[PDB]
Amino acid sequence: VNYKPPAQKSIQEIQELDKDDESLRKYKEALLGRVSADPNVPNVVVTRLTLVCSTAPGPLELDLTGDLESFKKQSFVLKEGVEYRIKISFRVNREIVSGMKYIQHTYRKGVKIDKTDYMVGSYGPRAEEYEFLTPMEEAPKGMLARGSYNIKSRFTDDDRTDHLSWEWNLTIKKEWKD
Amino acid sequence: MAAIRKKLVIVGDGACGKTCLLIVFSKDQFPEVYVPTVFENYVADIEVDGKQVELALWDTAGQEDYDRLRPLSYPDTDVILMCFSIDSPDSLENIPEKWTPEVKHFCPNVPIILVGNKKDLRNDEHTRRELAKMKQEPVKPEEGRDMANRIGAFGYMECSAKTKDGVREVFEMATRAALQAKKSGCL
Ligand SMILES: Nc1nc2c(ncn2[C@@H]2O[C@H](COP(=O)(O)OP(=O)(O)O)[C@@H](O)[C@H]2O)c(=O)[nH]1
Ligand SMILES: *C/C=C(\C)CC/C=C(\C)CCC=C(C)C
Numbered sequence: 001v002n003y004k005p006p007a008q009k010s011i012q013e014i015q016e017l018d019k020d021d022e023s024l025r026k027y028k029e030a031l032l033g034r035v036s037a038d039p040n041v042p043n044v045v046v047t048r049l050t051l052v053c054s055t056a057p058g059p060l061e062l063d064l065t066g067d068l069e070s071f072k073k074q075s076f077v078l079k080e081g082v083e084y085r086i087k088i089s090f091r092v093n094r095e096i097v098s099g100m101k102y103i104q105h106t107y108r109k110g111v112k113i114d115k116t117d118y119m120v121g122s123y124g125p126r127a128e129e130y131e132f133l134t135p136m137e138e139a140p141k142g143m144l145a146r147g148s149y150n151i152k153s154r155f156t157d158d159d160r161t162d163h164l165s166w167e168w169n170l171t172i173k174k175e176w177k178d
Numbered sequence: 179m180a181a182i183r184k185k186l187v188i189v190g191d192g193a194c195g196k197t198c199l200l201i202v203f204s205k206d207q208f209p210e211v212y213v214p215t216v217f218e219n220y221v222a223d224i225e226v227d228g229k230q231v232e233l234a235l236w237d238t239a240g241q242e243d244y245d246r247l248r249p250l251s252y253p254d255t256d257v258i259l260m261c262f263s264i265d266s267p268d269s270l271e272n273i274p275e276k277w278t279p280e281v282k283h284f285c286p287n288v289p290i291i292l293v294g295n296k297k298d299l300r301n302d303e304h305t306r307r308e309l310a311k312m313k314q315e316p317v318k319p320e321e322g323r324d325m326a327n328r329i330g331a332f333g334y335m336e337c338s339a340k341t342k343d344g345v346r347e348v349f350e351m352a353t354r355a356a357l358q359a360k361k362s363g364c365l
């Protein structure tokens with residue numbers, strides 16, 4: 001600490017570097033691809049945000065491909081004291097994402113009560129969708145912990161890009177929805 | 179009872195002895211003829227504390243030219259081998275300056291093993307003679323151990339890939355760190 005972000009470099013520039021170093025050519029081939037796509041699409045597209053829980057009646061999902069405004073109009077219930085992971089499903093199209101991470105500010109009536117962030121990591125472009133699981137964590141419980149919360153979620157990377165920003169609502173009850 | 183799969187990534191300054199360390203442990207032979215810049219992903223069977231383990235070995239390119247590409251190997255890492263060279267005190271200086279910042283950034287909770295390579299050159303006279311001209315000397319074990327606790331590593335180890343001495347004890351400690359993990363979430 002502190003960590004300085006990598007210098008800007010396109011994938012083409014990378015493959016040109018040490019062009020005839022077979023051990024290094026295989027190394028790049030190992031990490032990068034064997035990728036073409038519409039140049040008019042964002043290099044990174046986070047698709048879904050899934051709640052993974054053993055206790056949950058069914059997997060819960062945040063579709064980040066539609067109108068993000070809708071999540072203010074609704075709430076998401078989470079049974080207190082359960083342990084869970086978060087599955088982040090994203091896609092990379094043209095260039096390397098350098099250290100993409102997930103920032104989550106949890107407010108309660110305009111009061112910041114929690115700040116969590118997960119390092120999703122660095123990913124090159126490919127056709128198949130990517131997937132990142134947070135380590136196992138557990139929701140709080142008690143009369144204080146129970147209640148309604150207001151969440152501001154954000155996806156960024158080492159280049160200070162905001163790939164996605166949206167707010168939504170979380171309610172912690174004694175039991176699940178059903 | 180099925181073999182446990184753990185991911186090992188090795189980072190550190192260029193030409194500090196990463197690739198040779200991997201090849202030696204993998205194939206039980208130091209490569210004197212040809213050494214790749216980066217070693218292909220080798221999966222090595224290894225048994226520690228009565229536990230069968232399949233150890234996936236990931237070599238990296240420590241060059242600054244790949245400061246953006248190299249981190250692609252980091253996800254799903256279970257244990258990391260942060261390396262420096264005993265004969266290069268400059269390489270040791272990069273441990274808290276370049277490598278610990280990067281590893282802790284991309285691999286937040288992955289256990290770190292600080293490795294001191296080429297320890298056969300510690301009492302080598304040619305090396306000492308060359309280092310003397312920079313008011314420098316080989317790294318002392320105390321210096322390495324100090325740095326390890328400073329960067330909050332799981333443990334300090336030194337080895338000599340050329341003599342194969344210490345290599346085993348490293349990857350055993352690395353496997354041990356990989357085989358283990360209050361409360362976390364959103365309190
Ligand atoms: N004396 C000594 N030399 C070594 C040892 N390991 C590697 N070397 C030499 O130092 C150089 C290190 O190369 P390499 O391992 O590929 O470096 P890296 O992969 O870039 O970190 C090679 O030329 C090796 O011959 C060692 O344990 N002792
Ligand atoms: C206090 C922080 C809370 C527990 C975060 C809760 C939500 C997950 C992260 C993501 C999935 C939410 C379901 C789709 C409802």
Ligand SMILES: OC[C@H]1O[C@@H](O)[C@H](O)[C@@H](O)[C@@H]1O
Pocket residue numbers: 041042043044045161163
């Ligand atoms: O979604 C990723 C986006 O990050 C921005 O910084 C770039 O300007 C875009 O080219 C890229 O598509």
Ligand SMILES: [Mg+2]
Pocket residue numbers: 193196197198214215216217
């Ligand atoms: Mg090498």
